[model samples]
Each structure stands twice: as structure tokens, then as C-alpha cells.
Target: LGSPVVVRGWLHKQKSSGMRLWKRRWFVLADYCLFYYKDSREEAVLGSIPLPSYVISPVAPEDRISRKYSFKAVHTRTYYFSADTQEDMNAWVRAMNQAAQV
Candidate 1:
């Protein structure tokens, strides 16, 4: 719907009309999707906060998957660890929380 759509979904592949194969095919034999959002809302991948280290792997996965809308990923590596004052930790937590809420 056009009413400020906020699609807080996991990164999965979907067939598009213009594209012959799924956009995910170019990278690997993996399924992916994104945490889409509109209006004045927020998403987990848009980590403006912090979280813990363990949550980073999955959360980072979600974030990288979310990048599909922009472009395909190649030779990419997702880090599960964060350093310093816990900014990375906090951000991952926020993303997980956002995903959980949806």
C-alpha cells in the first residue's frame, strides 16, 4: 500500500518481472531479502544504536542482505565482532530488536 509502507522483513529472494532469475543468483546459491521501510520509521539494518557481539553475525547478515535493493554482494565478509565502547554491539542489538518487532 502507498500509506507509508514499512516492510520489516528478512532478506529473502523474490522473482522480479524484469529479471529472468532471482537477484540473489548472481552472488551465490543463497536466499536473501531486505528490511524495507518508508515513512519516518527505522529498521534494524540501519543500526543507529548498539547491541552485543553474539548478535552481530545474524544481525550483520540481515544488514548485508538488506543491501540487495542497492546492489549485489560479491566477495563479502560479514563480521560478527564489534570493538570499542560497544557501538557495534548496540547497533546489532537494535537491528535484532527491530527485526523481532516485525
Candidate 2:
């Protein structure tokens, strides 16, 4: 981790407990870790993913819901995220890409 960079977006993370399904969480990226909270509140702890080995790239066309400006994080597993707009998606990608290089 280097400088602190926060990128907020709708994150689809794998469920650790309960039914096996992806849930949307308010995610904040900082210091090489993606911390997600419930309902945009940090008080409610959900989970986090380390970005050390994450390979960031655009979502593929074959996947469902690919129309939105989205990216896929591939490491030990794959996680998907969709931005509100293309500009936002681009910014997140650029920031995370730079962070990964460090």
C-alpha cells in the first residue's frame, strides 16, 4: 500500500455465509484493500478484499449485465463491479491500476 485512494462503487462480492449469491455493497478502495460496508455505512461490517494480486480489466461482453461500464478483478477469485458512468469506471480502473503497480 502506498498513497490512500478511495474509489466508491457498487461491488458484487461473494457471500461468505448464508445463501451462495453476490450482494451489492458500498465499497471503498484504499491502501491496496477494497473495504465494503453495508448500506454505505462503515459501521456495518461486511468484508474486504486485498488487491495485491488483483488483475483489473474490463468486463467481458459474454457475461450478463455487461452493458454497464464495469470491471472484473481476477486474483484467487473473480469479482465484478459496475460504475454509475463510464467516466467513473475509467477513473476507478486508472486509480487501481496505478496502485497495483506500486
Candidate 3:
């Protein structure tokens, strides 16, 4: 049996549709997807990514953004994100990985 979970943090979502431009947004993880919103209290969904189809893994320690405790989603396209802390990063990765397995 599985139930949805929610993890909140400042997610560095790319702007300009490119990695060069990055901004932090309120992130929500639940229902096997990662969702970001402009405001946590707002019901509107800014964006979301389905986790099951993408590989969820931690970034290398030597990576520039690794200090942010980041991870990547790779498929036909790649998306990168960083959690608030190392613990938060681990929690997100674990939840997403579990979701992917199902």
C-alpha cells in the first residue's frame, strides 16, 4: 500500500528555459510528481514533473551545485533541482525513487 507524501522547500527551477537563468520557487512533492508554485498558500500549480518516468538520483559531490544537495531527472530531457538541505535532498530522492518503483 502507498500513500502520497508532501515535501516543501525552495526549488531552483530554471528560468529562460535554460540552466543559466535559475530562480527559487516553493516546491511541493506528492502524488508521484514534483510541483512548484509561486506561493505556498495559493492553490494554483506553477509547474509539475512526473517522477515515475524519470531517473531520480543525487548529484555528484564535485558538482558545483552539489552544496545545495541537488539531484537530476533524466529522460529525453533533463531537469535539475536542489533542496533546502542535505537531509531534505535525501528525503526527496528517497520518496521519488520509491514512487518511481511503483
> What TM-score does candidate 1 reach?
0.20
Give lDDT per model, in order.
0.28, 0.69, 0.70
TM-scores of all predicted structures: 0.20, 0.73, 0.75
| Candidate 1 wrongly placed segments (more than 4 Å) | 1-85
Candidate 2: residue pairs that collide: none
Residue-wise C-alpha lDDT for candidate 1, range 1-102, written one tens digit per residue: 223322232232333334423322111101122233222233223322121222223333534333322221212122222222345334433454443333
* Ordering by TM-score: 3, 2, 1
Q: For residue 86, give model 3's deviation from the true position in Å.
A: 0.7
Candidate 2 or 3, higher lDDT?
Answer: 3
Per-residue lDDT tens digits for candidate 2, residues 1-102, read: 243646776655544444536667877778777777886656654777777778788887764553477787777466777777788788878767765654
In model 3, the Cα lDDT at residue 52 comes to: 76
Best by TM-score: 3
Q: Which residue pairs clash in candidate 3?
A: none
Best by lDDT: 3
Q: Which stretches of candidate 3 lie over 4 Å from their true place?
A: 1-4, 16-19, 61-67
